[PDB]
Amino acid sequence: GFFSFIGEAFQGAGDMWRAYTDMKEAGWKDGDKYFHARGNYDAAQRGPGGVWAAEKISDARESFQEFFG
Amino acid sequence: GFFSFIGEAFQGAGDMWRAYTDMKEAGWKDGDKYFHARGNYDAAQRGPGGVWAAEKISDARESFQEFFG
Amino acid sequence: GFFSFIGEAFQGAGDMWRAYTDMKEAGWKDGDKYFHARGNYDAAQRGPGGVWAAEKISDARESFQEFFG
Amino acid sequence: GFFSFIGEAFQGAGDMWRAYTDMKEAGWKDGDKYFHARGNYDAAQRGPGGVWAAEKISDARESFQEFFG
Amino acid sequence: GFFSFIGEAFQGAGDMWRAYTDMKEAGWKDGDKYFHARGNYDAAQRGPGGVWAAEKISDARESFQEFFG
Amino acid sequence: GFFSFIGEAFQGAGDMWRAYTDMKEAGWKDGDKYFHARGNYDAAQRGPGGVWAAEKISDARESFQEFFG
Amino acid sequence: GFFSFIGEAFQGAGDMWRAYTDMKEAGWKDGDKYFHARGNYDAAQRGPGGVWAAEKISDARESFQEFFG
Amino acid sequence: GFFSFIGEAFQGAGDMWRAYTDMKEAGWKDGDKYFHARGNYDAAQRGPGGVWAAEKISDARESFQEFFG
Amino acid sequence: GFFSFIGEAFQGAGDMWRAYTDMKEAGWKDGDKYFHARGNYDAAQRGPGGVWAAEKISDARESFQEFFG
Amino acid sequence: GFFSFIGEAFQGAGDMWRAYTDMKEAGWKDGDKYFHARGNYDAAQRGPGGVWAAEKISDARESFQEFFG
Amino acid sequence: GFFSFIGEAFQGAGDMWRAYTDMKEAGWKDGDKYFHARGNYDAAQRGPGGVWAAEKISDARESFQEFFG
Amino acid sequence: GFFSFIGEAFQGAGDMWRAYTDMKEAGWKDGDKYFHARGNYDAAQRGPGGVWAAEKISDARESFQEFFG
């Protein structure tokens, strides 16, 4: 079992990034979730970058290179 | 089992990025979710970048290269 | 089992990016979801970039290259 | 089993990007979903880029190259 | 069992980054979650960078290199 | 069992970064969570950097190098 | 890269079942190989059985069944 | 990189079941190999059985079954 | 990198079941290999059985079953 | 890097089951290898059994079962 | 790095089951290896049994079961 | 680094079950190895049993069970 959560440059109000992986005879309740935004400036910003999602990189030679100038 | 969640440059109000993977005799309730936005400036912005989604990269030679100038 | 969720430059109100993969005798309820937007400026923006979706890259030589100028 | 969800430059209100892959004797209810937009400017924008969807790239030589000038 | 949560440049109001992995005869309740933002400047900002999500990198030679200039 | 939580550059109000891993006949309640922000300047900021999430790096030669200039 | 060698019921003298998969500036020499057989009884025998050679079986339902009576 | 060698019911004299997978500026020599057999009885024998060679079996339901009576 | 050697019911004289996987500026010599057999009885024998060679079995339900009667 | 050698029911004379995985500026010599057999009875015998060679079994339910009667 | 050697029911004369994994500027010599057998009875015998060779079994439910009657 | 040697029911003459894992500027010599067998009875015998070779078993439920009757 592999679980990898990664969050960047985000604004939230609730109930995020959760992993439930074994749960017998379980019960739960969540409530209301409000996002209210007025008059903001430059919220939720991210620069450049690549996103590599794999289950297994093997014998990667001279690979996975990112250059920023 | 492989689970990979990656979030960037996003604005949210609730109930995001969740993984439930084993659940017998389970029960749950979620509530209302409101997004209210007025008069914002430059929200939810992302720069350049590539998104590679694979299950297995093998013998990648001189590969997976991104250059930014 | 492979599960890869990747989200970028997005604005949301609820119930996103979820993976349920094993669930016997399960039950659930979700609520109303409202998106209300007025007078915004430059929301949900993304720069350039390629999206590679594969199950297996093999012997990729001098491949998968993106240049930004 | 391969599941790859990738979302970019999008605005939403609810119930998106979900994967249910094993579910015996299951039951669920979802609610109403409202999108209300007035007077916005430059919402849901994306730059250039190619979308490669495959199940297996093999011996790709000097391939999969995108140049931006 | 592998669980890796990593959060950066984010603003929140509640109930984030949680892992429940073994829970028999369990029950829980969560409350309302409010995000209220007015008149902010430069919130939720992130610089450049790549995100590598794998389950196993093997024999990576001269790989996984990022240069910032 | 592996559990790794890492948080950076984030502002919060409650109930974050929690791991529950063995819990039989358990019960709990959480309360309301409010985030209220007005007139701030330069909140939730992060510099550059890469995020490597793996379950096992093996024989990595001359790898995993990041240069900042 | 996939390499699967399977040998059964065979008699040999040399230089069998070899896989060379990456070799730059390499050199090698092999010698003479003699098989001499006289007066044997019941050499190199195999019973029944099917040989399935594929690169990927998917959603095989109630399939790949061999019965021996 | 995947390498799987399986040998059964075989008689040999030398230089079998070898995998060379990375070798720069390499050199080697092997010698003569003699098999001499006289008057044997019941050498190199194998019973029944199927040989399944794949690169990936997925969602195989009630499959891959062999019965011996 | 995956290397799996499995040998059964075999008679040998030398230089078998070898894996060389990284070797720069290497050199080696092997000698002569003789197999001499006279008058044997019931050498190199194997009973029934199936040989499954894969790189990844996923969600195999009620599968991979062999019955011997 | 994964290396798994398993040997059963075999008779040998030398230089078997070897793994060399990192070797720069190396050199070696091996000698002659003789197998001489006369008048034996019931050498190199193996009973029934299946051989499963994979790189990763996932969510195997009620699978990989062998019955001997 | 994973190295697993397992030997059963075998007769040998020399130089078996060796793992060399890091060796710079190394040198070695091995000698002659003789197997001489006459008039034996019931040498190198093995009963039933399955051989499972994997790099990672995950969420195996009610699996990997062998019954002997 | 993982090294696991397990030997059962075997007869030998020399130079077995060795692991060399770090050796710079090393040198060695081994000698001749003789196996001489006459008139033996029931040498090198093993009963039933399965051989499981993995690098990581995870969440194995009601698994890895062998019954002998």
Coordinates of C-alpha atoms in Angstrom, one line a residue, chain H residues 11 40-45, chain I residues 9-11 38-46, chain J residues 9-11 35 37-47, chain K residues 9-11 35 37-47, chain L residues 40-46:
Chain H
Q11 CA 20.9 -31.9 -17.9
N40 CA 21.6 -43.9 -19.5
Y41 CA 18.0 -44.6 -18.5
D42 CA 15.2 -42.0 -18.0
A43 CA 17.3 -38.8 -18.1
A44 CA 15.8 -35.3 -18.5
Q45 CA 12.1 -36.2 -17.7
Chain I
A9 CA 15.5 -31.2 -11.1
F10 CA 18.7 -30.4 -13.1
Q11 CA 22.2 -31.9 -13.2
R38 CA 27.4 -43.7 -17.9
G39 CA 24.8 -46.3 -16.8
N40 CA 22.7 -43.9 -14.7
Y41 CA 19.1 -44.5 -13.7
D42 CA 16.3 -41.9 -13.2
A43 CA 18.4 -38.8 -13.3
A44 CA 17.0 -35.2 -13.8
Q45 CA 13.3 -36.0 -13.0
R46 CA 10.5 -33.6 -12.2
Chain J
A9 CA 16.8 -31.1 -6.4
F10 CA 20.0 -30.3 -8.4
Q11 CA 23.5 -31.9 -8.5
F35 CA 31.0 -34.0 -13.7
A37 CA 28.7 -40.1 -12.9
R38 CA 28.4 -43.9 -13.1
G39 CA 25.8 -46.4 -12.0
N40 CA 23.7 -44.0 -9.9
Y41 CA 20.1 -44.5 -8.9
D42 CA 17.4 -41.8 -8.5
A43 CA 19.6 -38.7 -8.6
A44 CA 18.2 -35.2 -9.1
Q45 CA 14.5 -35.9 -8.3
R46 CA 11.7 -33.3 -7.5
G47 CA 8.1 -33.7 -6.6
Chain K
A9 CA 18.0 -30.9 -1.8
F10 CA 21.3 -30.3 -3.7
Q11 CA 24.7 -31.9 -3.8
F35 CA 32.2 -34.2 -8.9
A37 CA 29.8 -40.3 -8.1
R38 CA 29.5 -44.0 -8.3
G39 CA 26.8 -46.5 -7.2
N40 CA 24.7 -44.0 -5.1
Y41 CA 21.1 -44.4 -4.1
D42 CA 18.5 -41.7 -3.7
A43 CA 20.7 -38.6 -3.8
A44 CA 19.4 -35.1 -4.4
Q45 CA 15.7 -35.7 -3.6
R46 CA 13.0 -33.1 -2.8
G47 CA 9.3 -33.4 -1.9
Chain L
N40 CA 25.8 -44.0 -0.3
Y41 CA 22.1 -44.4 0.6
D42 CA 19.5 -41.5 1.1
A43 CA 21.8 -38.5 0.9
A44 CA 20.6 -34.9 0.3
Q45 CA 16.9 -35.5 1.1
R46 CA 14.2 -32.8 1.8

